[PDB]
Structures are given as C-alpha cells and as structure tokens.
Design a protein around this ligand. Structure first.
Ligand SMILES: [Mg+2]
Ligand SMILES: [Mg+2]
Ligand SMILES: [Mg+2]
Ligand SMILES: [Mg+2]
Ligand SMILES: [Mg+2]
Ligand SMILES: [Mg+2]
Ligand SMILES: [Mg+2]
Ligand SMILES: [Mg+2]
Ligand SMILES: [Mg+2]
Ligand SMILES: [Mg+2]
Ligand SMILES: [Mg+2]
Ligand SMILES: [Mg+2]
Ligand code: NA
Lengths: 56, 71, 212, 99, 102
RNA sequence: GGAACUUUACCAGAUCCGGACAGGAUGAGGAUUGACAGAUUGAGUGUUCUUUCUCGAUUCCCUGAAUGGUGGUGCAUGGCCGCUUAUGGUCGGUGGAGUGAUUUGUUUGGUUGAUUCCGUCAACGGACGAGAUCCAAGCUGCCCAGUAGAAUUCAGAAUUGCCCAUAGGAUAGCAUUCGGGAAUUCUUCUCUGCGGGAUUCCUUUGUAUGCACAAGGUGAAAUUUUGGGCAACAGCAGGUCUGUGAUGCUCCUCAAUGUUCUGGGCGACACGCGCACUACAAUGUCAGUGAGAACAAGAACGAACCUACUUGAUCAAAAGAGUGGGGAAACCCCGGAAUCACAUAGACCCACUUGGGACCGAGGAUUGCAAUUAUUGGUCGCGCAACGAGGAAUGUCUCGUAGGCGCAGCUCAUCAAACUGUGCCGAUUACGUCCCU
C-alpha cells in the first residue's frame, strides 16, 4: 500500500507546497501576480527579459 | 541655484562665435536659431544654451568678452 | 475564454525569457548573442544570433533541427508551426555576450587573467568601440579572492543612457578552486542605422553646425 | 515508482529515435505524453527520468536543463544503440538527420 | 454596411504606433471609411520586489513597470478587404486581432 | 518569514530508493514487482509475517562507485544586496618639484546642492562622478472615439402657486426637472503617441569685471519646476552556501542529514526589549439622513476567477441558492469609501459613564482532506481589565507636507494590527544656525 501512500499529501495540491518557481522550483517568495509564478530573486534576475523595466 | 555648467557655456560660446550675425538680445528668436543650428537630445539643455547665448550677446554689446573671438 | 491582453503580454514575456535561457545554455560554446522571434498566424519565426554559425547549424542543419525539435516539444508547437534561423553577428567585437564567452574560453585554457582580459579589451577597441571594461573576480591568486578590473576608452555609468550606449554580459566561469565571475561592458559607437548602437547622439553632447 | 514496464521503455525508445530529442518537465509527479504514428502514449515522468538517467550514464545521450525542463538528445553511439535495440533497418534515421 | 475592428496591442510604443500608421495608410489607399484610430488607455503592470536576496540591510525595493498600449481601428469594408489590408510584414511584438462588430 | 497539513529546515515514529553505471552471485525449472484475508501496526499501511495468488528480466545481493541534501564553512568563492556616503567625490597621460615615499594638476578668493562656475595659477590636456539622460505629476497642440462624453431638436412622462412647520432663523435667482425613445451635431470635460512650454527670461537691490544672488514680474509652473529612478573610485573577512540545475573543499548516504507519510513543534509563559493597533472621551459616543475618491485586480464543451441582480423573505445576522455579465475604458460601475456635513429642532451630561473593549460563556454558519474561540465571519451575554493623557529618555517631519481617514493590491483554499501603492480632509512652525549629533 506504499504506492498509494507515496506523495498522497502532494496529490491534493493545496498550499505553499504545491506551487514552485517556474525557473528554479523553489517554493519561497513566489510572485503570483499576473500568474507569473516566479520567485522574487529569479524575477529580479529575469525581469528585463520578461519585459519589465526599472523606472521611477 | 541656476549655474551654467561647462557644457552649456562651451556650447553657447561656440554658438556666439559661429552665428554672431543671426543673434540679438531676445531669448526666443535666439532659441529658434539655436534649435536650428545645434544637435542635442535635450530641449532643456538647448533652452539653457539660448539663455546663456543671450547673456553673452548682451555682454558683447558692452565691450569684448573672454573666450569669444570675432572678426 | 481567450486570455486577457495583460495575461497575453505576461505569457509572451515569460516564453521569451525561457527561450533565451535555453539557447544561452545550449549555445554557450558558440557566440550566442541573442534571439529574436516573430509570430504570425502562418507560423513562428525564431532567429538565432551567433558567432560560429556553422556549429549552431551543424552538418546539414543537424544541430538546428535538434534545437527546433527541443523547442517544438517543450512549447507543444504543432508540425510546421515553428521555424528556426541562424544569422551571424555583424561585428563580433561589439557583442558583450560573444566577448564574455571568448574570455571564458581563454580562461579555461589556464591563461593568466591579466593577459586574457587585455587581449579581450584590445580586440574590442580594435573593432571600433568607444570603450571597454573587463572585470574578473574570484580565487585567482589563492584562497583570498580578489576582484580585478581592466579599463580602456570611456564608459558611462549613470543615467539611463548607459542602458542604450553600453552593453554588458556576465558569466560564472567554473574552475577547480571554485567559481570565477567574468564581466564585460562595451561602450557602443554611433551608427546612424541603429543595427548596432543607439543611433542617437549622447545625451550630454551638443554639436554646433558649421554654417555654409 | 521507477519500475519501468518493458513496453513503455520500447515506446519511449521508439519516440526517442524517431524525434531525435525528448523534452520532459522535471516533476516527480506528472505524466509525459508522446506521439508515435498518430494517437498518443503516456508514461510517468519519473520513468522517463529513470530511463534517461540510465542512458546518460552509458554515454548515449546529451543532456540539457533549463526552467524545470530536460532536453535529451541521442548522439551517434546512442543512435547506433537505439538502432540495435529496436532492430531497425540500417537506413533508419532520426527526423533531425533525415533531409 | 458591416464594421470590422482591428485591435492593435503591444508593449513597444514605437512598434504599435508604426503598425497603426501603416494600417491607416493602407486603408486610406483602399478608399474605405475609417473610424479611429482610438488610443485606448495605457495600462501599467507593476511588480515591486525587495532588491536584496536574503533579508539583510535597509529594506530597499525595485519597482518594475510594464506598459501595454492598445489601439483600435474600425473599417467599413468586407472581410476579404480587411484581410488584404492587414497582409504586410508586421513589426515584432505587435499583436493584431480582427473582430466583426454587430 | 501573515507556518493547521504542505511549506519545514526541528522532535517522535514508519516508509521508499529518487544507489545511475560497471564487474561478480542467483535467475524463464522464474531475477523480481504488486497484493485478497487474518495479525504486526498510528495506519480495512503486503511495513513485515502466515497463507495464497500476480507480474515479468524492468529488478533485486555485493564490491567499487554514484546521487540527492533548506548538511557545514559567507573567514574558500560567484552573483546580488546593504553600508562606509547623500554628500561632492575619483583617477591617468605628458610636463614641473623631490634621493624617495609622494606631490602639483585637484590649492587659494567669490559663487553653487555640486571638484557648479568665474577668476588666478607649473601646468597643460583628458576620463568618470555631479549635471545632462530616463519615468511620473501639474498647463498645453495635433489625433481620437459604437470600451469617453456633451449640447440641441422632436418626443413621452412628473411637479405646477390661496398654502409660510411644534416658531422655522440665515443663506443667490424675481418655468423646471426624468443614466427605466429616437434623430442629427460636436469635442469643453475623459482617453494618448509624438510634440510645445521655463531660461534667472524680464525689471530693480545689494554685490560694484565676471560667476551669481534677493525681491518682484510674466506665467499652469519661478528655481536641480515637483517627486522618483540611475549614480564614480576605494573598501567591509558587512549579508546571503535557507532563491536557483550558482559553486570549491568537507559531512551523511538504505532503520539515510536523500524522499515521502502520520502526529507534534515553529504560537508554550505571573518575564524583559523593539515595531504596531485600540484608547483614555463632549473638537465625544450612540442612532439616523446627505453629498461624495483614486490606484487597482479578476477564470485553467464548460469549470474554477471577479462580480451585479433576484431570491432566501408569510419575518435576525452571517449564510445558502438561482439567473445573467466580464479576458476587463465594455461587467463590477453613474465605482454611493472613510475622514466629513446636517436648523436631525434625536439620546447621553463629566462618570471608569451610553468612554474603552481586554478577557471569557452559549447557539449557529462558513474555508479546508483536516480548525474547541489557535482558521474566520455573525448573534446574545461578560465588560465591576487596565486605561482619566503617560518618568528618565526618544523617533519622524518644511506643503497638498505632518497628522488624520479609508480603499486596493500583495501574501491568499481560509486569515492583515504588515508591507507596496492610492486617493480624501488638511494644518502649526521655520525658511535659520553650527549649540548637540
Ligand atoms: Mg543625475
Ligand atoms: Mg511533516
Ligand atoms: Mg563576507
Ligand atoms: Mg559575498
Ligand atoms: Mg611625473
Ligand atoms: Mg603626473
Ligand atoms: Mg593629488
Ligand atoms: Mg563575517
Ligand atoms: Mg530532507
Ligand atoms: Mg462601561
Ligand atoms: Mg462603547
Ligand atoms: Mg508580515
Ligand atoms: Na460582542
């Protein structure tokens, strides 16, 4: 019955533990705005390529 | 707090040297001339150049000035 | 359901960022300098900028076809909806990505930091750059890391005109003692076309026109 | 479960030979879908990861990784091994190699 | 007759203006009635993140902005004519969508 | 970094291999995989066992390896960030001085936020930084509207003139209105890509050559226009190995520091400190009425996401249910925010009081797989908990600013006393100095 028990709580897919950065798979400091799903550090690294720019 | 930096002053001296006969004591006509005869990405810089160019013309009325050479 | 225009812009930006990272990792050995994609209803056009065009193509376009297959499978592009082109960079010495890759390759050959950086700078200035700046940092002389910078010509650091007159690239170069960082910044000259450089004069330069 | 049923391995190898590359998202939980002569077939991503790990350790594929996705590519010896494994004709060629 | 609306959206102001101008010229060559172009409100996408990785030092922030420009043009032309007008090499990063109004 | 599970790194247990590959042992006469029932167990968990099946060469065992790790070391590193350091700072070439370290330039006078300028000059020339550039506000031009509006013309419908309240003071006029229908006409208001506009420009004073300054004018705007962003060179053993498939070297590696699953913990206190929120009341608290913002967000054949309307309702709230709309200038939405206003002829009348709302009791509903006030609303109780303006000390701030007030986004299945923005009401004081730092 271990195949059913294995990752059964991750089957539910709810909470901070079910979403990860689409670049680095880290589950901390995620940006959900506009469904970006990028952690803030990776977002700072990749923002120019994504299209954002530092103004104001 | 409105000092003219060396960029503005150097540009104005060049403008007065090259285009003396097209300038007068009026800021606005001098501004039009300077927009015609200079290249710059900055409108504010051109305005400052026109202001100092008019100042230089007013001084050149009352005797010669240092850094300007005309025939 | 159709996605909102805000969502569409975000999705397109994320796609471009991922494609750039994938091509940067895949074509690190070649002079990968950028990617530009054009989308139409007919199909999607992807143009790869590289220095060693033959290696990016491979024999009979084997490498380019493998890259096309990778992109097609990852983004689920249907058959015939994706096409990849490879064009060479006009002036290699003005591309910071190409020069950081060149500096990295010279470093991996156990070359001295000063020697390789000076060669990079000399080649960049020979290609007609306004200036150049190469920074190498890490465990160069021993356990105590130090950061060395080599400069030539002139460079602009402040304002936002440095984002358009200067191009920069940085990489981690891996060695046996650990990580080495390599940075190259090239002050681009003025070209009226805009293919290279920003094509407008510097923001603090006033040129007086000679009369007739 | 990394127990790979043999037909799943055969389908993965056939798709790998036909389309010279395979791209798979790196998630322990998930399903990878490929197309073989129309239709589809689905094998868990953990089993694809296991098969490609075995192939990589045997110096038969090149590996790349970016943004939660793998990119595996059959090299020359990997191509020869695939041809011997599926008993394809000596004229059998991947799509990226066919003109 | 029937109205056809082109919705031109992009994140590059120069590109969106260039495409809008080219469409305007092409439509004027076809001698068709034109409504617009209307410059729709510009939307700004804002992401404000801490600058530091980890959490040390003065809490300084980065404000990343992404601006979206949208234009709409109404053509009193058949679908074939509108398809002809939009058949040209479009600037990259510009999305042109065709819609029939009621 | 607002942690119920997850996250999670900690604790008590139990699983899996996610030990690739290579060399040997066994092995279709079956290497192995997965399990019914009983029992072992926290586990109607083949974890292991009994007893029976089922798969099929994928795997097991055993040696070297390998892999993964929010393991260590940030005093081995990369990248980034903070700080020195908000100020005006920095460094070559050639020349000059010196045996040299070094120095001059780059000092001095006036001016400027400014190593900003003028002047002088053993320097002359250059390079950065400052300035310029960039982004938002304010004024404005061309464009432009069937996702913004307006005005007129026909309609249709409503009030309609002896009227003066419980007494109804003061405050303009001497035919009007109806976002529950058409028709033209137009761009004042809204939308915006590129432009214009301000510069010490004009006039006086003191400076008195210049560089400037102060008052006033012109003006939407009068001095870095206002607010931001960017920001040199040197360093710090400053932070981060808990962002990453960034990493050297080290530690663990099958009863694991890998990975899952179960249950706890990160929240425990007669304790101390930092940052908030709510108050101590009458310039108020209650009940009513009025007029009225701005940034914003909305979902993955349909289905998530956000909403309006209706209903529930022949009788509390919170709910629960339908029918629609919205991919967002289109629906929400004429965005009825709270500060606020009210000649409401309302209650309270100086008290720990109708101030305060801590603590706690009982019903009920909702999110979620899982919630005993430690999810979170709502109802009635409790209020007899301090608290009546706060010692030594101490923070921030000069104009649409402080303060006050809400709103949105972000976290987010559920939960803002937080942060990031927004608009609303809107001052006192100074326009100085080097006493303190
Ligand atoms: Mg600046
Ligand atoms: Mg746990
Ligand atoms: Mg350190
Ligand atoms: Mg560091
Ligand atoms: Mg010397
Ligand atoms: Mg010298
Ligand atoms: Mg010196
Ligand atoms: Mg330290
Ligand atoms: Mg672990
Ligand atoms: Mg009381
Ligand atoms: Mg009360
Ligand atoms: Mg918080
Ligand atoms: Na109560």
């Amino acid at each position: 019955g271990h195949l059913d028990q294995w990752r059964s709580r991750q089957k539910i897919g709810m909470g901070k533990g079910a979403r990860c950065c689409v670049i680095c798979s880290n589950q901390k400091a995620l940006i959900r705005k506009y469904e970006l799903n990028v952690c803030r550090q990776c977002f700072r690294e990749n923002a120019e390529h994504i299209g954002f720019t530092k103004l104001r | 707090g409105k000092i003219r930096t060396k960029t503005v002053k150097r540009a104005s001296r060049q403008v007065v040297e090259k285009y003396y006969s097209k300038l007068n004591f009026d800021f606005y006509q001098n501004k039009r001339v300077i927009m015609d005869v200079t290249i710059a990405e900055s409108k504010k810089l051109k305005n400052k150049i026109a202001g100092y160019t008019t100042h230089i013309m007013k001084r050149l009325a009352r005797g010669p000035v240092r850094g300007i050479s005309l025939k | 359901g159709p996605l909102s225009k805000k969502r569409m812009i975000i999705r397109d930006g994320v796609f471009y960022a991922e494609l750039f990272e994938f091509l940067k990792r895949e074509l690190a050995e070649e002079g990968f300098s950028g990617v530009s994609y054009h989308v139409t209803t007919l199909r999607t056009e992807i143009v790869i900028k590289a220095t060693k065009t033959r290696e990016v193509l491979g024999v009979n376009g084997r490498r380019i076809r493998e890259l096309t297959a990778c992109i097609q499978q990852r983004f689920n592009y249907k058959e015939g909806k994706l096409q990849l082109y490879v064009e060479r960079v006009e002036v290699r010495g003005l591309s910071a990505m190409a020069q950081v890759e060149s500096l990295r390759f010279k470093l991996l050959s156990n070359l001295q930091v000063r020697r390789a950086a000076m060669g990079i700078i000399r080649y960049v200035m020979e290609s007609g750059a306004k200036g150049c700046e190469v920074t190498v940092g890490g465990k160069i002389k021993g356990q105590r890391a130090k950061s060395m910078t080599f400069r030539d010509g002139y460079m602009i650091k402040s304002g936002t005109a440095h984002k358009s007159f200067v191009d920069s690239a940085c990489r981690h170069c891996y060695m046996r003692a650990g990580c080495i960082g390599v940075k190259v910044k090239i002050m681009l000259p003025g070209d009226s076309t805009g293919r290279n450089g920003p094509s407008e004069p510097l923001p603090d330069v006033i040129t007086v026109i000679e009369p007739k | 479960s990394t127990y790979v049923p043999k037909p799943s391995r055969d389908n993965v190898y056939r798709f790998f030979f036909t389309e010279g590359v395979i791209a798979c998202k790196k998630d322990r939980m998930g399903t990878w879908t490929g197309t073989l002569g129309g239709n589809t077939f689905t094998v868990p991503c953990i089993q694809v990861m296991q098969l490609m790990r075995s192939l990589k350790s045997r110096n038969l594929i090149k590996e790349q990784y970016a943004w939660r996705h793998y990119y595996w590519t059959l090299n020359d010896e990997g191509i020869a091994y695939m041809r011997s494994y599926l008993h394809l004709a000596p004229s059998a060629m991947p799509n990226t190699q066919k003109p | 007759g029937q109205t056809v609306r082109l919705t031109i959206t992009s994140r590059n102001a120069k590109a969106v203006e260039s495409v809008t101008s080219q469409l305007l010229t092409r439509a004027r060559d076809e001698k068709v009635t034109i409504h617009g172009p209307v410059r729709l409100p510009t939307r700004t996408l804002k992401i404000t993140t801490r600058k530091t990785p980890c959490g040390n030092g003065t809490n300084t922030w980065d404000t990343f902005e992404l601006k979206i420009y949208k234009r709409i043009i109404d053509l009193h032309a058949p679908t074939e004519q509108v398809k002809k007008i939009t058949s040209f090499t479009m600037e990259s990063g510009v999305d042109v969508s065709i819609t029939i109004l009621d």
